[PDB]
């Protein structure tokens, strides 16, 4: 069936291209990052800005929201994943730790919990840190190209990363070795997300197609593409059901895809520039979307 969503809110205040956006665990708070150098916490319900966090480096590529909501993370060309404390007794937001140690730019950061964050970098390796001391407890080498995205399983026992080598690797969080090899893309993989079951993930590559990989088969379960769409995917997200797949293309409009029918069923054309980030709430009642236009849009 067709899907139509009507930009219930418009989040204005970013003055540069937005690059990443993560929902809070309460499905109401939202952190977004832009090349402006600001990491803004949004009240989705009222479009209020809770915090505005000045970033040391404006070349940010990823943002994260701590599942507890106490901390957010930012990373990019500065080669460092910074951690910010949102519950400071002094009332301001301040950096708690800086996770230096990556040899390339960081493309994705995701908190497993407090004192444990996993980051991916362009140096072809991912690293699992602890924020208490700031030391890489594990490293996940095995990619031959820059790693672009991360997706943590619902149980946070495994995470999946995609790299420019057109391959996606699942990793054992607690043991450190790659457990699965997925390939088939004809160009860079640019966005990765987990199907809510946790036994599958969707890849979005610059070859202008999305594809669904099941950890139990590693085969081409479904291919989401069409002849009239000839541009890559910048972000990929899943709805709470898993039947709806959303992807932010460079044609300036997100496309909603039926994950099982493999046919497009909607479009979220409301941006004047490349859609960069895209994520669905934990509640499933909202769908934020950021783009280089410098506005986020809540779609329902």
């Amino acid at each position: 069936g067709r899907i139509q969503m009507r930009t219930r809110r418009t989040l204005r205040g970013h003055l540069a291209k937005i690059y990443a956006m993560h929902w809070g665990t309460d499905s109401r708070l939202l952190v977004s990052a832009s090349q402006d150098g600001k990491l803004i916490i949004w009240d989705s319900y009222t479009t209020n800005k809770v915090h505005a966090i000045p970033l040391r480096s404006s070349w940010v590529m990823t943002c994260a929201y701590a599942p507890s909501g106490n901390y957010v993370a930012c990373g990019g060309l500065d080669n460092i994943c910074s951690i910010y404390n949102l519950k400071t007794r002094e009332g301001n937001v301040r950096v708690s730790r800086e996770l230096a140690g990556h040899t390339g730019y960081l493309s994705c950061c995701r908190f497993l919990d407090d004192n444990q964050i996993v980051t991916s970098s362009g140096d072809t390796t991912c690293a699992l840190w602890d924020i208490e001391t700031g030391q890489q407890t594990t490293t996940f080498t095995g990619h031959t190209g820059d790693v672009m995205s991360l997706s943590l399983a619902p149980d946070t026992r495994l995470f999946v990363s995609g790299a420019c080598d057109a391959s996606a690797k699942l990793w054992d969080v607690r043991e450190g070795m790659c457990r699965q090899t997925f390939t088939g893309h004809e160009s860079d993989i640019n966005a990765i997300c987990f199907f809510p079951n946790g036994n599958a993930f969707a890849t979005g590559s610059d070859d202008a197609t999305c594809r669904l990989f099941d950890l139990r088969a590693d085969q081409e379960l479904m291919t989401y593409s069409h002849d009239n769409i000839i541009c890559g995917i910048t972000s990929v997200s899943f709805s709470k059901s898993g039947r709806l797949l959303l992807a932010g293309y460079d044609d300036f409009n997100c496309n909603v895809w039926d994950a099982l029918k493999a046919d497009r069923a909607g479009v979220l054309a409301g941006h004047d520039n490349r859609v960069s980030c895209l994520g669905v709430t934990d509640d499933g009642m909202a769908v934020a979307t950021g783009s280089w236009d410098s506005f986020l849009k809540i779609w329902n």
Partner: peptide, 19 residues
């Protein structure tokens, strides 16, 4: 192995009633 798609479809259909 071929029934994985049907299993996921049944999962989604059962879940969809209480989205």
């Amino acid at each position: 192995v071929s029934k994985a798609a049907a299993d996921l479809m049944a999962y989604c259909e059962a879940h969809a009633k209480e989205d």
